[PDB]
């Protein structure tokens, strides 16, 4: 019973690490997205801020 | 540092100066009796040492089980009596448990078990209490040695650690070995030794266990009292130096408020 349930609960542990990998790389790519937009949003004010 | 705050602090240390100077006079009498009783029981532990001079017995190679016994009182305010025994005990179970033998300690008195319950909480056979509040005796050593047999633990090598009283200022923590299995107790020096059987050597070594706890109930009680005298003189000298430095601060602070309130009046009249 245990050697059956050792492989049973293992494959539910194998699929947990692929849910965690699929959202981590999807989010860590996404955190650089608006941060690329933020710096251009930053720079377009600073050239306006210098003139005013 | 106002006038009220200096007074209430100075009044406190004048109390603590009396209490510790009375407490030295209490413990000067307890040591003066506990100096007297030890020299009768000095010749009692002469006999059990004289057994091992003519028959030189040692712990030969290795044991399966072990004991460590450490005596103390339950009372504090004695300086370096209890930590001169617990730190000796942790200096041997680290030295042991690598040759493979199983160790189990017993601490008579509360203050050993207080130190060694956060790291060595598992090797405890039994614990005792209520040691040294009344003077220790021989019937007290026959309750330690009797409950040590109603335990099931077969022990084949042990030792006891106590403070050998040297002088009023100085004590020395020593150790003494205990041979408890009949195997190590019947060796080459015991070849000349007559009529005692294995069943009589069962009887003789057990009276030595009540004996060798009694020799260490008369050493660690004198040294616990004569370090309760010397460490109370140094709480009384260290209080005389704290009030004489606080009388002077009080005297200047008393004079500086007479002057302060008086200039408030001199300037209150002349401003009219």
């Amino acid at each position: 019973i245990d050697l059956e349930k050792s492989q049973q609960a293992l494959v539910q542990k194998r699929h947990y690490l692929f849910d965690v990998q699929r959202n981590n790389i999807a989010m860590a790519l996404e955190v650089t997205y608006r941060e690329r937009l933020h710096r251009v949003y930053k720079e377009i004010k600073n050239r306006l801020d210098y003139h005013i | 540092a106002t006038l009220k705050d200096i007074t209430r602090r100075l009044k406190s240390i004048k109390n603590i100066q009396k209490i510790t100077k009375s407490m030295k006079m209490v413990a000067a009498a307890k040591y003066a009796r506990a100096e007297r009783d030890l020299k009768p029981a000095r010749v009692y532990g002469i006999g059990s040492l004289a057994l091992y001079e003519k028959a030189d017995i040692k712990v030969p190679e290795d044991k399966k089980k072990h004991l460590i016994i450490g005596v103390s009182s339950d009372r504090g305010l004695c300086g370096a009596i209890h930590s001169s025994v617990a730190k000796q005990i942790k200096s041997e179970v680290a030295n042991l448990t690598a040759a493979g033998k199983e160790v189990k300690i017993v601490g008579v008195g509360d203050k050993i078990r207080g130190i060694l319950h956060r790291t060595h909480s598992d090797q405890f056979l039994v614990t005792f209490k209520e040691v040294g509040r009344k003077p220790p005796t021989f019937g007290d050593a026959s309750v330690i040695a009797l409950e040590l047999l109603n335990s099931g633990y077969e022990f084949d090598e042990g030792s006891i650690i106590f403070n050998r009283f040297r002088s009023v200022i100085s004590y020395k923590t020593e150790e003494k070995p205990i041979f408890s299995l009949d195997t190590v107790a019947s060796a080459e020096s015991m070849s000349i030794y007559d009529d005692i059987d294995a069943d009589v050597l069962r009887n003789y070594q057990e009276y030595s266990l009540a004996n060798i706890i009694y020799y260490s109930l008369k050493e660690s009680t004198t040294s616990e009292q004569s370090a309760r005298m010397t460490a109370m003189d140094n709480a009384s000298k260290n209080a005389s130096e704290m009030i004489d430095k606080l009388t002077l601060t009080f005297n200047r602070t008393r004079q500086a408020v007479i002057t302060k309130e008086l200039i408030e009046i001199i300037s209150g009249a002349a401003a009219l």
């Binding site: 990998q21 981590n24 996404e30 608006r34 690329r36 | -």
Partner: protein, 147 residues
């Protein structure tokens, strides 16, 4: 608002149980916490253009209204999608290992199901037999049992 959800995966995800690879998951959830709320404040949209606001009240044009006209007429440089190889190649090798290990334990369940049913074969009664009890308890050749 390009944002993805997930499942509740915090309890046994540190219990991945590699070959003593505890740091593989204990660093994995540690990256997972900080990346979550930080990329949420990235994912939706950028704020209102405050470049067009104060350049209109500013009179010195030429390099003011034209710079906001030129630099705000292009596309957003998005990121590259380099994470695809370990998505498929790491996944199926654990699912292919699920096929053999669920059957190699099944024969170990099947042989253990046969090992007990043969133990019920040996005795039909307390006074049953002198040879049916000679399967579990052993016999041997000459001079085996010393004592």
């Amino acid at each position: 608002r390009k944002l993805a959800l997930k499942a509740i995966d915090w309890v046994a995800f540190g219990e991945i149980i590699p070959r003593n690879q505890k740091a593989i998951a204990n660093s994995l959830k540690s990256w997972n916490e900080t990346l979550s709320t930080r990329l949420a404040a990235l994912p939706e949209k950028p704020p209102a253009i405050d470049w067009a606001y104060y350049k209109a009240t500013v009179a010195k044009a030429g390099l003011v209204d034209d710079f906001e006209k030129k630099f705000n007429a292009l596309k957003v440089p998005v990121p590259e999608d380099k994470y695809t190889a370990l998505v498929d190649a790491e996944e199926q090798e654990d699912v292919k290992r699920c096929a053999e290990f669920l059957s190699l334990s099944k024969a170990r369940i099947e042989a253990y199901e046969k090992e007990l049913e043969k133990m019920k074969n040996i005795i039909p009664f307390d006074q049953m037999t002198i040879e049916d009890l000679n399967e579990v308890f052993p016999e041997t050749k000459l001079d085996k049992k010393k004592y």
